[PDB]
Amino acid sequence: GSSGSSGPDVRRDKPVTGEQIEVFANKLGEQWKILAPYLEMKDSEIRQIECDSEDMKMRAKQLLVAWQDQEGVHATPENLINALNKSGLSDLAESLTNDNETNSSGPSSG
């Protein structure tokens, strides 16, 4: 194939969108219940989402959505990541943030 991957270089600048949400959800998984108490949601909601959808992915999405429709344009990934951290979801944070594994570029040192 090939390794190109087009697109601009922007991060933690705009509020997550359906494009990211869906993605996030998958990442979230069952952690939607760990980010719920960290997203400043309502207990009822948690109980709702759970009912709304049985699957985890869905439940996660539903949350992200509500969390997205909650904060509004303030629904950024960096803000979510921050929570993930304290939420002890370093995985997600690291995932979203996605800095690198071993080598990325490192433009000289100094």
From Swiss-Prot:
Expression is altered specifically during apoptosis and is accompanied by the appearance of novel forms with smaller apparent molecular mass. Polyubiquitinated, leading to proteasomal degradation; probably involves NEDD4. Ubiquitous. Expressed in various cancer cell lines. Expressed at very low levels in normal breast epithelial cells and highly expressed in breast tumors. Expression is strongly associated with an aggressive phenotype of breast tumors and expression correlates with tumor size and the metastatic state of the tumor progression. There is a cross-link at K42 (Glycyl lysine isopeptide (Lys-Gly) (interchain with G-Cter in SUMO1)). Residues 17-100 form the Death domain. It comes from the Eukaryota. Induction: Up-regulated during cell proliferation. It is linked to Deafness, autosomal dominant, 86: A form of non-syndromic, sensorineural hearing loss. Sensorineural hearing loss results from damage to the neural receptors of the inner ear, the nerve pathways to the brain, or the area of the brain that receives sound information. DFNA86 is characterized by progressive, bilateral hearing loss that is most predominant in the high frequencies, begins mildly during the fourth decade and gradually progresses to severe-to-profound deafness in the seventh and eighth decades. Component of the THO subcomplex, which is composed of THOC1, THOC2, THOC3, THOC5, THOC6 and THOC7. The THO subcomplex interacts with DDX39B to form the THO-DDX39B complex which multimerizes into a 28-subunit tetrameric assembly. Component of the transcription/export (TREX) complex at least composed of ALYREF/THOC4, DDX39B, SARNP/CIP29, CHTOP and the THO subcomplex; in the complex interacts with THOC2, THOC5 and THOC7. TREX seems to have a dynamic structure involving ATP-dependent remodeling. Binds to the hypophosphorylated form of RB1. Interacts with RNA polymerase II. Interacts with LUZP4. Belongs to the THOC1 family. This is THO complex subunit 1. It comes from Homo sapiens. The chain holds residues 561 to 657 of 657 of the full protein.
